[PDB]
């Protein structure tokens, strides 16, 4: 929907760590930059997170392809929320993946 957050991951590093996150991302998740920059976004996952959906994202990434999934995530305070995540690979002219961009939408309603 209209309200959403955005983040950028560096695919030139093995674990796709975050290099940038929108104002909304920090405010929604409750985390600060000096807390999540340089880290993979998997810290948003938790107990009820469907490993099957997580695997789908992992596969798309390893294949350097776009993907959209609905996942249960948790704020820094531990409270849950439903996240409709869409990941998009950004490539250089040589065809290789340089960055991955992510758009998150809280669809908890």
Ligand X SMILES: Cc1cc2nc3c(=O)[nH]c(=O)nc-3n(C[C@H](O)[C@H](O)[C@H](O)COP(=O)(O)O)c2cc1C
Among 4, 22, 26, 45, binds ligand X (CB under 6 A): 45
What distances in angstroms separate CA 43 from CA 10, 17, 29, 31, 93, one per listed residue? 16, 11, 10, 10, 32
For ligand X, the closer of residues 31 and 102 by Cβ is 102
What distances in angstroms separate CA 69 from CA 2, 25, 96, one per listed residue? 17, 17, 23
Among 24, 26, 37, 40, binds ligand X (CB under 6 A): 40
**Interaction of residue 28 with ligand X, rule CB under 6 A:** no
Q: Which of residues 56-95 bind ligand X (CB under 6 A)?
A: 57-58, 61, 71, 73, 83, 85, 87
Per the annotation, binding residues are 40-45, 58, 73, 83, 104
């Amino acid at each position: 929907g209209l309200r959403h957050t955005f983040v950028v991951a560096d695919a030139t590093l093995p674990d796709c760590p975050l290099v940038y996150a929108s104002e909304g991302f920090y405010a929604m998740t409750g985390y600060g930059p000096d807390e999540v920059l340089g880290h993979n976004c998997r810290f948003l996952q938790g107990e009820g997170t469907d490993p099957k959906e997580v695997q789908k994202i992992r596969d798309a990434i390893k294949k350097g392809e776009a993907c959209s999934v609905r996942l249960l995530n948790y704020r820094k305070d531990g409270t849950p929320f439903w996240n409709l995540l869409t990941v998009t690979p950004i490539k250089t002219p040589d065809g290789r993946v340089s960055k991955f961009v992510g758009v998150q939408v809280d669809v908890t309603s």
